[PDB]
Amino acid sequence: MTMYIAFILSTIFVIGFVGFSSKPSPIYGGLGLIVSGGVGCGIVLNFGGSFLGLMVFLIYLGGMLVVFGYTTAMATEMYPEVWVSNKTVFGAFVSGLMMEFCMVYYALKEEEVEIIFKFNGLGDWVIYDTGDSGFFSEEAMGIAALYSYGTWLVIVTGWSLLIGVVVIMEITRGN
Amino acid sequence: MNPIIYTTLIMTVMSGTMLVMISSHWLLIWIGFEMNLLAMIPVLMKNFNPRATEAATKYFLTQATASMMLMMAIIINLLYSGQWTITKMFNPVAMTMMTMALAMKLGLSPFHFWVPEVTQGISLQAGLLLLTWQKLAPLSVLCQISQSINPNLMLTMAMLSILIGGWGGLNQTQLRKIMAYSSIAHMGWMTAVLPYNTTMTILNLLIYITMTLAMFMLLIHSSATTTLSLSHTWNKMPVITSLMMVTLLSMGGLPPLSGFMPKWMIIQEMTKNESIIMPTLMAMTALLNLYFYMRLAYSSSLTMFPSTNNMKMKWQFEHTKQMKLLPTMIVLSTLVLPMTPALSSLN
Amino acid sequence: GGAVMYPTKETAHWKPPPWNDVDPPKDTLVSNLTLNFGPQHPAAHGVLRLVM
Amino acid sequence: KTLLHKYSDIPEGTECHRKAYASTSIGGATGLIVSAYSIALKPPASFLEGVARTGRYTFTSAAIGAIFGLTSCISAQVREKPDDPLNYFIGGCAGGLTLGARTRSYGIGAAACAYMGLTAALVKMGQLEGWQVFAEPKV
Amino acid sequence: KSASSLLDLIWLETILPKTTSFIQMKMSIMVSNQKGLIKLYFLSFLITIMISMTLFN
Amino acid sequence: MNIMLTLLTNVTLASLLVLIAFWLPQLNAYSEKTSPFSMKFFLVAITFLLFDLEIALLLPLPWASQTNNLKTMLTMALFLLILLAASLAYEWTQKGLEWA
Amino acid sequence: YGPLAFVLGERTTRKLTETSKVITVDGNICSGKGRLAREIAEKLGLRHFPEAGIHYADSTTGDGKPLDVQLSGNCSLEKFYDDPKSNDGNSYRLQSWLYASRLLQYADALEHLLSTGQGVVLERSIYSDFVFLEAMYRQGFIRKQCVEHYNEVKKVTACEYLPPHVVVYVDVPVPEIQSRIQKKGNPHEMKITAAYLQDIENAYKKTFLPEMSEKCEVLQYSAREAEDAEKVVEDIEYLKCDKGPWPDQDDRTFHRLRMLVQNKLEVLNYTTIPVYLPEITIGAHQSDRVFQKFTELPGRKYSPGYNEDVGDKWIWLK
Amino acid sequence: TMMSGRPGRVPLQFLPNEARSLPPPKLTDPRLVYMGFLGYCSGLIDNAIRRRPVVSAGLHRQLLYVTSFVFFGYYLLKRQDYMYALRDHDMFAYVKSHPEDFPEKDKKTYGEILEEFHPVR
Amino acid sequence: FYIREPPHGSPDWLKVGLTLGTSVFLWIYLIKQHKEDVLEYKRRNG
Amino acid sequence: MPLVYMNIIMAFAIALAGLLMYRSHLMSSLLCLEGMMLSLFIMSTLIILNTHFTLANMMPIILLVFAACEAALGLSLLVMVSNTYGTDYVQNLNLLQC
């Protein structure tokens, strides 16, 4: 079973996406997003991306959606909408799981599934490379090259964040 | 909004478009689009109204979806080619997704529904920026990826945009909505020639930009957002409404006005590629645009609508602010037809 | 001068957009939360019902 | 595009049942698309109302396609001229008449007959002469 | 009765000018639905995306 | 598998305690006991987000110190930090840091 | 002034001092408000704007001399006094023109206050003009639709400007006001009915005074008390209206206001709202004739400084 | 598209050094005169908008308009001629380099050719 | 005549000078460029 | 393409569909926006790690930098909408038509 941990995680990722995509109250949506973020971190870690996946755990889960939650709390709704609360939400939730199951089964049964692209049912372990990175974390060096090579990216991103602060101030002015 | 902050936001919008038109790496092009959106949103809400907030929200949602689809297309092209360079796109599905995203950014139908609403919500100056400057970046991106573009999808979007722009304008008595529908139709005209010859798209974009700049500056000078408020202008500033009539006739494409040359050259290039039915339908469908232009002209200048007694007060005063480029924009929008062969410069 | 040309029956009832801004609704965004500070409160000395 | 290929592969003026079936399918697809767009832009009050609207539009379009193909192929057989655009014109006017009948209006029927028949004859002429509605960039 | 009225002022006008004007008016009413609900036309975006993926590969 | 084991064990232990604390003591026999303002100061939360972004951008610095172009690296790192300080100063001076 | 000036560091707040204080002296007809307003302006060193009339704009534009009624105003207060219920619609034309004149005066007043920092004493204002309209509507002089149009214009325009800090109401009883009108001897003024004056007072006290008291403090004085101008000046100097808009306003709002008031056309933009009331709608032929006549006026053909007729020179290089 | 990818094209260069081989646009070119006319019209429209005397006021401003329009139009015409000359040069070079794609055709006199007559009866 | 001084009033001799100077420089530069271009064309094309 | 790519592309498609089909709340749609961004991050990270594109391992980070900028903009708009209408409901964004 440990042979397809990545696939199990990807299925959980899709399930969380169906959860927050069916639009329950933003509380449960936040829960689905949090679960999906953790699971994406798991997949990234499995592929060797410890730092990148951990970034989602902190700057995405404990970041963008940590305020998403703080926001919903300020705009409190009368009732916590759940999947079963609206027949459509529950129906779409079930259909989404069913859709995943259909493609999953087809991919496994039909060695080569083709929804919009062509996918092979072989385990993800196949695609991995047999090279050695030596005394290095390739992800770490690539990310740290943002200061040595990606100076232009640094400039543009910093300017965007400053203008984002100014923009948020201006939008929340309200005159 | 503090004027220094306003200048910084406008420069950020222009810098985003410059990054879009300057970068050879897809990630940076998407970054430029993100900067354009981030800087644009507060600019749309310079004057705080519930309508301004609603327009900003609609525009943000639409542009955010477009950017997300664009980034997915970039990621797919990376997956199948491993190339970040803006060049031929090596996956047809990525090409279709990118085309939909860029069309949504341009307001091409059937992604047009947000253009009239956003234009009506925002002020005339924000509308000018939205309908002139914002079009530059997606059109640049499409021109760079023109070869990969599937001609059928682009042509269908262009024809639908022309049809819908012509249809919507007939029903509108709000000047901003009329301008938005005209913008939709002209965007369809520009994107029609994109698969065939990009220089024609650039020429049409320049002519359209001059005409819309002139029209919006005339509206700002007349401070009219409705047909009747513009009708009142003949009593105050008859020259303004006369020049508005001339610019409207140009926008309709009537010869010998400058508005004729983009349509003429587009028809030429399409015919050279054996496209005969499509140019014919586009030219005929432009008559709806021409019709509501003519109705606006009847309301404004050709016919004298009733004024109000309080206008005698405005007679004594004069316009304080002068828009320097308005006369040259009018001249270019109306009398540049004898100078088409200079269309080899942008070439 | 209508809100929209060729107005349908439903659209005919609809008024033209306002000249400058939309009229804001009556509040419905925020108010003053009313709290019984005491009397059981530790800081209320036990017998103070401070309605704030 | 498979439906269009099915309609094209059947030789003109032959196998009238199959041609009518393919035209019926094309009409059904177009009616479903129009129904989806109408449901989206103009919301139906109830799910049953949405189903009724979808069925109405799809049946109208399928009837139009079926009559067009049926009449056109029958006319091609009887006249024994397969390539004449007049067969397509007759089919188009018949489809327009069916549109009028479904709309229960004479003026709609006459206008639809005229315009749709002219468009159908134009489509046949384009097939014959190699007209390209969408031309590959050759410049 | 025929030339001045039934043809010139009625039927030729009904055929070319008036019917086309009426059709354009009806289409203008359809397009300018004057509803403007984000929920409504965003669904159309989904339908358009699906249809484009199907038709244009 | 070690990290997965640790996560599983901790979660199961905590949930087991929650069970023995929500249901096990709930058995004990008893009787019947009967039984927001729009925060505009949420701007602080939003500013945290844009500052957390710079936080993320700054994390690679320990490995960034290992490059050979230490001049460029230092210039860009101080550039980002000075831009963050400028953002803080702007929000401070424009009374945007109106906490509570 | 311009965005450039604000960037150059021009700040209205710094210029504004205690002297800055928009004082409106309001009252019924012939209440003596002008005397008290003039005295307050003299004693407190504040600019005194006489009450806006039909040709207020004519005074602020061109030569300054009043223009012909057809060219400016197209309304007569004497006509209103003699024929309040005329089918010409002169009543509502007069009221709307007066409201526009008071809007221009308030803009000019605010511009003076922001540009110099000197307070302004106004005799009535846009916030008090509704009293006459209400009186006319109660007496039946104007229709309901005229009132609705006036309300639309006021709602669109007055919101932009900041209300006065100090409201001074001189109260004189209606019968004594009738006695004063008789003593003054103006033949048209004598025709004013008692009910019209009473409705003016009712509108004032019932609506304008409470509504102003909500924003800031209102100094209400009787005729004898209003005569002691120095006491009124002292009371104003010892007012402390911490509540109100002016303390809330900062440099940004002042810049926006400074820009608005500088553009007089922008100030009067919505006074010409396209509502086709019979009273205020001018036909195309008459409008064209009157505009031509205004254009033929000396010094009005071209923008100020370019009219050669009134002695402008160096136009070719100006 | 088309000339954008020509080899040797320096990006963001208005007039390449090769263009100097071409004749300069004559200062009496009708196109340059039309550009000056456009500038003069712009001056007139500016005067009309600002409610100045249309044909007499701001002679310096009208002069600046005409000078700017002519100055920009000169370089505009020079670049236009350069681009058209480049097109012609590339076309002729390609025709020479691909003789088979552009074969010389046998010329015949009308007596040799047969063109059917359609009588107008 | 006007109560308030005309905004432009006396001619802006600074502005007039700047405009005339810019126009003259434009014309002179154009003439020199034209001469140079004529010389270069004759030189490069014999 | 391995099945993980299929799953993540499916997640993006699902999130896109959810965004394009609003129900009442704007926050749910903004949740779908953030979710789509997560899908894109995971897809980009997997591609870059598998291909050993060392110099592109920062692209996922910049994507998230701008993802949070977009989220912040969305919330900054949502608060204003709520203030003007009392709810985040989409049906209140109805003043602008056509």
mmCIF file of N, CA and C in Angstrom, chain D residues 12-92:
data_model
loop_
_atom_site.group_PDB
_atom_site.id
_atom_site.type_symbol
_atom_site.label_atom_id
_atom_site.label_comp_id
_atom_site.label_asym_id
_atom_site.label_seq_id
_atom_site.Cartn_x
_atom_site.Cartn_y
_atom_site.Cartn_z
ATOM 1 N N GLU D 12 -24.859 13.282 -50.856
ATOM 2 C CA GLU D 12 -26.053 14.099 -50.998
ATOM 3 C C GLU D 12 -27.060 13.398 -51.899
ATOM 4 N N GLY D 13 -28.323 13.410 -51.484
ATOM 5 C CA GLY D 13 -29.358 12.750 -52.249
ATOM 6 C C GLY D 13 -29.391 11.245 -52.126
ATOM 7 N N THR D 14 -28.785 10.680 -51.086
ATOM 8 C CA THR D 14 -28.795 9.241 -50.874
ATOM 9 C C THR D 14 -28.957 8.954 -49.390
ATOM 10 N N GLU D 15 -29.595 7.826 -49.083
ATOM 11 C CA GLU D 15 -29.795 7.382 -47.705
ATOM 12 C C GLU D 15 -30.483 8.469 -46.882
ATOM 13 N N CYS D 16 -31.673 8.864 -47.340
ATOM 14 C CA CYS D 16 -32.354 10.027 -46.776
ATOM 15 C C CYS D 16 -32.598 9.876 -45.281
ATOM 16 N N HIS D 17 -32.872 8.656 -44.826
ATOM 17 C CA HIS D 17 -33.103 8.436 -43.402
ATOM 18 C C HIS D 17 -31.866 8.789 -42.587
ATOM 19 N N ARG D 18 -30.691 8.349 -43.046
ATOM 20 C CA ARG D 18 -29.457 8.629 -42.321
ATOM 21 C C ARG D 18 -29.124 10.114 -42.338
ATOM 22 N N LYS D 19 -29.331 10.772 -43.480
ATOM 23 C CA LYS D 19 -29.099 12.209 -43.559
ATOM 24 C C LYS D 19 -30.026 12.961 -42.613
ATOM 25 N N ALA D 20 -31.300 12.565 -42.575
ATOM 26 C CA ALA D 20 -32.245 13.186 -41.660
ATOM 27 C C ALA D 20 -31.839 12.952 -40.214
ATOM 28 N N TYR D 21 -31.357 11.748 -39.902
ATOM 29 C CA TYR D 21 -30.914 11.452 -38.545
ATOM 30 C C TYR D 21 -29.725 12.320 -38.146
ATOM 31 N N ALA D 22 -28.753 12.472 -39.046
ATOM 32 C CA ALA D 22 -27.593 13.305 -38.744
ATOM 33 C C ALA D 22 -27.993 14.762 -38.550
ATOM 34 N N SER D 23 -28.875 15.271 -39.411
ATOM 35 C CA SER D 23 -29.348 16.640 -39.244
ATOM 36 C C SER D 23 -30.112 16.797 -37.936
ATOM 37 N N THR D 24 -30.897 15.783 -37.564
ATOM 38 C CA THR D 24 -31.608 15.817 -36.293
ATOM 39 C C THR D 24 -30.634 15.887 -35.130
ATOM 40 N N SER D 25 -29.547 15.117 -35.205
ATOM 41 C CA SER D 25 -28.536 15.153 -34.154
ATOM 42 C C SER D 25 -27.872 16.523 -34.067
ATOM 43 N N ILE D 26 -27.548 17.118 -35.217
ATOM 44 C CA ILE D 26 -26.913 18.435 -35.212
ATOM 45 C C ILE D 26 -27.844 19.465 -34.589
ATOM 46 N N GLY D 27 -29.113 19.436 -34.994
ATOM 47 C CA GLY D 27 -30.088 20.322 -34.391
ATOM 48 C C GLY D 27 -30.219 20.100 -32.900
ATOM 49 N N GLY D 28 -30.194 18.839 -32.469
ATOM 50 C CA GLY D 28 -30.281 18.559 -31.047
ATOM 51 C C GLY D 28 -29.112 19.132 -30.272
ATOM 52 N N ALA D 29 -27.904 19.006 -30.821
ATOM 53 C CA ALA D 29 -26.730 19.558 -30.152
ATOM 54 C C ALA D 29 -26.824 21.074 -30.044
ATOM 55 N N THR D 30 -27.210 21.736 -31.138
ATOM 56 C CA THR D 30 -27.341 23.190 -31.094
ATOM 57 C C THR D 30 -28.431 23.618 -30.121
ATOM 58 N N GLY D 31 -29.551 22.897 -30.110
ATOM 59 C CA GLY D 31 -30.614 23.217 -29.178
ATOM 60 C C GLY D 31 -30.184 23.053 -27.736
ATOM 61 N N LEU D 32 -29.417 22.001 -27.448
ATOM 62 C CA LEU D 32 -28.912 21.811 -26.093
ATOM 63 C C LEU D 32 -27.974 22.940 -25.693
ATOM 64 N N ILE D 33 -27.107 23.370 -26.612
ATOM 65 C CA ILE D 33 -26.194 24.468 -26.300
ATOM 66 C C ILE D 33 -26.977 25.741 -26.001
ATOM 67 N N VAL D 34 -27.958 26.051 -26.851
ATOM 68 C CA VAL D 34 -28.776 27.241 -26.634
ATOM 69 C C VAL D 34 -29.541 27.125 -25.324
ATOM 70 N N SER D 35 -30.015 25.920 -25.004
ATOM 71 C CA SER D 35 -30.734 25.708 -23.757
ATOM 72 C C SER D 35 -29.835 25.957 -22.557
ATOM 73 N N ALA D 36 -28.600 25.459 -22.607
ATOM 74 C CA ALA D 36 -27.671 25.670 -21.504
ATOM 75 C C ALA D 36 -27.391 27.152 -21.311
ATOM 76 N N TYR D 37 -27.139 27.862 -22.410
ATOM 77 C CA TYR D 37 -26.868 29.290 -22.293
ATOM 78 C C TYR D 37 -28.080 30.043 -21.762
ATOM 79 N N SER D 38 -29.278 29.685 -22.227
ATOM 80 C CA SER D 38 -30.481 30.352 -21.748
ATOM 81 C C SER D 38 -30.691 30.099 -20.265
ATOM 82 N N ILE D 39 -30.467 28.860 -19.823
ATOM 83 C CA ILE D 39 -30.615 28.534 -18.410
ATOM 84 C C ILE D 39 -29.631 29.341 -17.578
ATOM 85 N N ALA D 40 -28.394 29.466 -18.058
ATOM 86 C CA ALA D 40 -27.392 30.229 -17.325
ATOM 87 C C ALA D 40 -27.773 31.702 -17.244
ATOM 88 N N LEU D 41 -27.934 32.347 -18.399
ATOM 89 C CA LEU D 41 -28.146 33.792 -18.425
ATOM 90 C C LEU D 41 -29.506 34.167 -17.851
ATOM 91 N N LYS D 42 -30.558 33.465 -18.262
ATOM 92 C CA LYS D 42 -31.892 33.692 -17.717
ATOM 93 C C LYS D 42 -32.261 32.519 -16.822
ATOM 94 N N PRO D 43 -32.175 32.660 -15.502
ATOM 95 C CA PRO D 43 -32.382 31.513 -14.618
ATOM 96 C C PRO D 43 -33.815 31.018 -14.687
ATOM 97 N N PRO D 44 -34.018 29.703 -14.704
ATOM 98 C CA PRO D 44 -35.378 29.166 -14.601
ATOM 99 C C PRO D 44 -35.820 29.102 -13.150
ATOM 100 N N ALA D 45 -37.124 29.281 -12.936
ATOM 101 C CA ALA D 45 -37.649 29.297 -11.575
ATOM 102 C C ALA D 45 -37.449 27.954 -10.883
ATOM 103 N N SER D 46 -37.690 26.855 -11.593
ATOM 104 C CA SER D 46 -37.612 25.524 -11.014
ATOM 105 C C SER D 46 -36.817 24.602 -11.926
ATOM 106 N N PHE D 47 -36.370 23.482 -11.354
ATOM 107 C CA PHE D 47 -35.687 22.466 -12.146
ATOM 108 C C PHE D 47 -36.600 21.920 -13.235
ATOM 109 N N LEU D 48 -37.875 21.706 -12.908
ATOM 110 C CA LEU D 48 -38.832 21.274 -13.918
ATOM 111 C C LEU D 48 -38.998 22.331 -15.000
ATOM 112 N N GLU D 49 -39.007 23.610 -14.613
ATOM 113 C CA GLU D 49 -39.072 24.675 -15.608
ATOM 114 C C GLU D 49 -37.851 24.647 -16.514
ATOM 115 N N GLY D 50 -36.672 24.426 -15.935
ATOM 116 C CA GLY D 50 -35.476 24.314 -16.748
ATOM 117 C C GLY D 50 -35.546 23.150 -17.714
ATOM 118 N N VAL D 51 -36.052 22.008 -17.248
ATOM 119 C CA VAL D 51 -36.185 20.848 -18.123
ATOM 120 C C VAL D 51 -37.177 21.133 -19.240
ATOM 121 N N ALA D 52 -38.285 21.802 -18.917
ATOM 122 C CA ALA D 52 -39.272 22.139 -19.937
ATOM 123 C C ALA D 52 -38.679 23.068 -20.987
ATOM 124 N N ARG D 53 -37.941 24.091 -20.548
ATOM 125 C CA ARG D 53 -37.314 25.007 -21.497
ATOM 126 C C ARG D 53 -36.290 24.287 -22.363
ATOM 127 N N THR D 54 -35.471 23.433 -21.747
ATOM 128 C CA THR D 54 -34.468 22.694 -22.499
ATOM 129 C C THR D 54 -35.119 21.776 -23.520
ATOM 130 N N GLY D 55 -36.166 21.062 -23.114
ATOM 131 C CA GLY D 55 -36.866 20.200 -24.046
ATOM 132 C C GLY D 55 -37.499 20.978 -25.177
ATOM 133 N N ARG D 56 -38.098 22.126 -24.864
ATOM 134 C CA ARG D 56 -38.712 22.939 -25.903
ATOM 135 C C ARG D 56 -37.677 23.381 -26.926
ATOM 136 N N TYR D 57 -36.569 23.961 -26.458
ATOM 137 C CA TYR D 57 -35.551 24.437 -27.390
ATOM 138 C C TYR D 57 -34.953 23.287 -28.188
ATOM 139 N N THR D 58 -34.624 22.184 -27.512
ATOM 140 C CA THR D 58 -33.978 21.073 -28.195
ATOM 141 C C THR D 58 -34.910 20.433 -29.210
ATOM 142 N N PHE D 59 -36.187 20.266 -28.863
ATOM 143 C CA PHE D 59 -37.130 19.699 -29.817
ATOM 144 C C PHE D 59 -37.352 20.635 -30.994
ATOM 145 N N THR D 60 -37.430 21.946 -30.745
ATOM 146 C CA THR D 60 -37.545 22.886 -31.855
ATOM 147 C C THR D 60 -36.374 22.726 -32.813
ATOM 148 N N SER D 61 -35.159 22.711 -32.269
ATOM 149 C CA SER D 61 -33.972 22.637 -33.112
ATOM 150 C C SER D 61 -33.869 21.289 -33.816
ATOM 151 N N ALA D 62 -34.185 20.205 -33.111
ATOM 152 C CA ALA D 62 -34.127 18.882 -33.715
ATOM 153 C C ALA D 62 -35.159 18.740 -34.821
ATOM 154 N N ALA D 63 -36.359 19.280 -34.613
ATOM 155 C CA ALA D 63 -37.366 19.265 -35.663
ATOM 156 C C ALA D 63 -36.901 20.062 -36.869
ATOM 157 N N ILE D 64 -36.275 21.218 -36.630
ATOM 158 C CA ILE D 64 -35.768 22.028 -37.733
ATOM 159 C C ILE D 64 -34.738 21.245 -38.531
ATOM 160 N N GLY D 65 -33.783 20.631 -37.836
ATOM 161 C CA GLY D 65 -32.760 19.867 -38.527
ATOM 162 C C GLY D 65 -33.329 18.677 -39.272
ATOM 163 N N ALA D 66 -34.247 17.951 -38.635
ATOM 164 C CA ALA D 66 -34.825 16.772 -39.262
ATOM 165 C C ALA D 66 -35.590 17.147 -40.519
ATOM 166 N N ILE D 67 -36.404 18.202 -40.447
ATOM 167 C CA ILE D 67 -37.149 18.621 -41.627
ATOM 168 C C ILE D 67 -36.198 19.092 -42.714
ATOM 169 N N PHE D 68 -35.168 19.863 -42.349
ATOM 170 C CA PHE D 68 -34.233 20.345 -43.361
ATOM 171 C C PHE D 68 -33.578 19.188 -44.095
ATOM 172 N N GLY D 69 -32.993 18.251 -43.350
ATOM 173 C CA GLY D 69 -32.324 17.133 -43.993
ATOM 174 C C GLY D 69 -33.282 16.267 -44.784
ATOM 175 N N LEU D 70 -34.439 15.964 -44.196
ATOM 176 C CA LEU D 70 -35.424 15.119 -44.851
ATOM 177 C C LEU D 70 -35.874 15.732 -46.171
ATOM 178 N N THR D 71 -36.301 16.996 -46.134
ATOM 179 C CA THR D 71 -36.774 17.671 -47.335
ATOM 180 C C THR D 71 -35.665 17.822 -48.364
ATOM 181 N N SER D 72 -34.459 18.193 -47.928
ATOM 182 C CA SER D 72 -33.370 18.407 -48.871
ATOM 183 C C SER D 72 -33.003 17.117 -49.589
ATOM 184 N N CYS D 73 -32.826 16.028 -48.837
ATOM 185 C CA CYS D 73 -32.455 14.769 -49.472
ATOM 186 C C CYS D 73 -33.577 14.251 -50.360
ATOM 187 N N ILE D 74 -34.831 14.412 -49.929
ATOM 188 C CA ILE D 74 -35.953 13.979 -50.755
ATOM 189 C C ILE D 74 -35.991 14.762 -52.058
ATOM 190 N N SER D 75 -35.789 16.079 -51.979
ATOM 191 C CA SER D 75 -35.784 16.902 -53.180
ATOM 192 C C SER D 75 -34.632 16.520 -54.095
ATOM 193 N N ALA D 76 -33.464 16.234 -53.520
ATOM 194 C CA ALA D 76 -32.336 15.810 -54.339
ATOM 195 C C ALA D 76 -32.638 14.500 -55.051
ATOM 196 N N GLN D 77 -33.261 13.552 -54.351
ATOM 197 C CA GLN D 77 -33.624 12.285 -54.982
ATOM 198 C C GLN D 77 -34.625 12.501 -56.108
ATOM 199 N N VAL D 78 -35.717 13.209 -55.818
ATOM 200 C CA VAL D 78 -36.798 13.344 -56.789
ATOM 201 C C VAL D 78 -36.332 14.142 -58.000
ATOM 202 N N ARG D 79 -35.690 15.284 -57.761
ATOM 203 C CA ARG D 79 -35.162 16.079 -58.861
ATOM 204 C C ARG D 79 -33.986 15.389 -59.536
ATOM 205 N N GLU D 80 -33.299 14.502 -58.820
ATOM 206 C CA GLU D 80 -32.180 13.702 -59.313
ATOM 207 C C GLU D 80 -30.976 14.580 -59.619
ATOM 208 N N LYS D 81 -31.004 15.849 -59.210
ATOM 209 C CA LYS D 81 -29.847 16.728 -59.252
ATOM 210 C C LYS D 81 -29.271 16.796 -57.846
ATOM 211 N N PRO D 82 -28.116 16.181 -57.586
ATOM 212 C CA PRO D 82 -27.615 16.140 -56.203
ATOM 213 C C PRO D 82 -26.967 17.437 -55.754
ATOM 214 N N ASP D 83 -26.288 18.142 -56.654
ATOM 215 C CA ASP D 83 -25.469 19.290 -56.289
ATOM 216 C C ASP D 83 -26.203 20.621 -56.379
ATOM 217 N N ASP D 84 -27.488 20.625 -56.682
ATOM 218 C CA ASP D 84 -28.183 21.892 -56.852
ATOM 219 C C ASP D 84 -28.465 22.526 -55.495
ATOM 220 N N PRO D 85 -28.092 23.791 -55.288
ATOM 221 C CA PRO D 85 -28.375 24.440 -54.000
ATOM 222 C C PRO D 85 -29.853 24.640 -53.731
ATOM 223 N N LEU D 86 -30.701 24.556 -54.759
ATOM 224 C CA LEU D 86 -32.132 24.746 -54.556
ATOM 225 C C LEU D 86 -32.701 23.723 -53.584
ATOM 226 N N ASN D 87 -32.150 22.510 -53.570
ATOM 227 C CA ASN D 87 -32.587 21.515 -52.597
ATOM 228 C C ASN D 87 -32.334 22.007 -51.180
ATOM 229 N N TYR D 88 -31.147 22.566 -50.946
ATOM 230 C CA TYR D 88 -30.842 23.128 -49.637
ATOM 231 C C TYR D 88 -31.740 24.316 -49.326
ATOM 232 N N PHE D 89 -32.064 25.127 -50.335
ATOM 233 C CA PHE D 89 -32.969 26.249 -50.103
ATOM 234 C C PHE D 89 -34.341 25.764 -49.664
ATOM 235 N N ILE D 90 -34.852 24.725 -50.323
ATOM 236 C CA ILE D 90 -36.146 24.166 -49.947
ATOM 237 C C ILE D 90 -36.087 23.628 -48.528
ATOM 238 N N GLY D 91 -35.006 22.920 -48.196
ATOM 239 C CA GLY D 91 -34.848 22.436 -46.836
ATOM 240 C C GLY D 91 -34.827 23.559 -45.819
ATOM 241 N N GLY D 92 -34.125 24.646 -46.134
ATOM 242 C CA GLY D 92 -34.053 25.761 -45.209
ATOM 243 C C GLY D 92 -35.391 26.440 -45.011
#
